[PDB]
Design a protein around this ligand. Structure first.
Ligand SMILES: CC/C=C\C/C=C\C/C=C\CCCCCCCC(=O)O
Ligand SMILES: N[C@@H]1[C@@H](O)[C@H](O)[C@@H](COP(=O)(O)O)O[C@@H]1O
Length: 133
């Protein structure tokens, strides 16, 4: 049910990422570089296991998980969180919990583009990714 998300995607638009990073306590110098970075995200499956790679000239991450099963994660900004990824309304919903805080990373396909919505506190960031062949 995750198959249309699979593949290699590149960032082509970003709105409010600085607000999102600042809400998470990311320092100004990291926000500055991040605001000019265009990651490539690779989403692959093997059976029930998804692997999500985020690559860039700055930070790089990789997670593997089963939908609906909690996993430990250490984020690009070094938060140690408890995570779960599920499908909800056709959207891939990633919830991170740490210190009583929460953030969601929600991916949906709209007109063939992958729209990533990042919410923490009041901050709502929308990042648009485009396929790669
Ligand atoms: C690996 C991500 C690459 C570049 C971004 C660099 C620093 C971002 C700063 C804080 C990380 C916040 C949590 C992760 C955001 C991922 C956004 C995305 O996948 O587009
Ligand atoms: N295992 C950790 C990750 O949990 C953390 O996310 C990352 C920070 O980002 P970067 O690797 O780009 O420094 O360092 C390691 O790879």
């Amino acid at each position: 049910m995750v198959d249309a998300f699979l593949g290699t995607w590149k960032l082509v638009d970003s709105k409010n990422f600085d607000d999102y990073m600042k809400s998470l306590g990311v320092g100004f110098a990291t926000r500055q570089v991040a605001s000019m970075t265009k990651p490539t995200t690779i989403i692959e499956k093997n059976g029930d296991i998804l692997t999500l790679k985020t690559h860039s000239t700055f930070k790089n991450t990789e997670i593997s998980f089963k939908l609906g099963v909690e996993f430990d994660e250490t984020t690009a900004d070094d938060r140690k969180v408890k995570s779960i990824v599920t499908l909800d309304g056709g959207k891939l919903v990633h919830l991170q919990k740490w210190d009583g805080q929460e953030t969601t990373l929600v991916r949906e396909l709209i007109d063939g583009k992958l729209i990533l919505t990042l919410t923490h506190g009041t901050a709502v960031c929308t990042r648009t990714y485009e396929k790669e062949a």
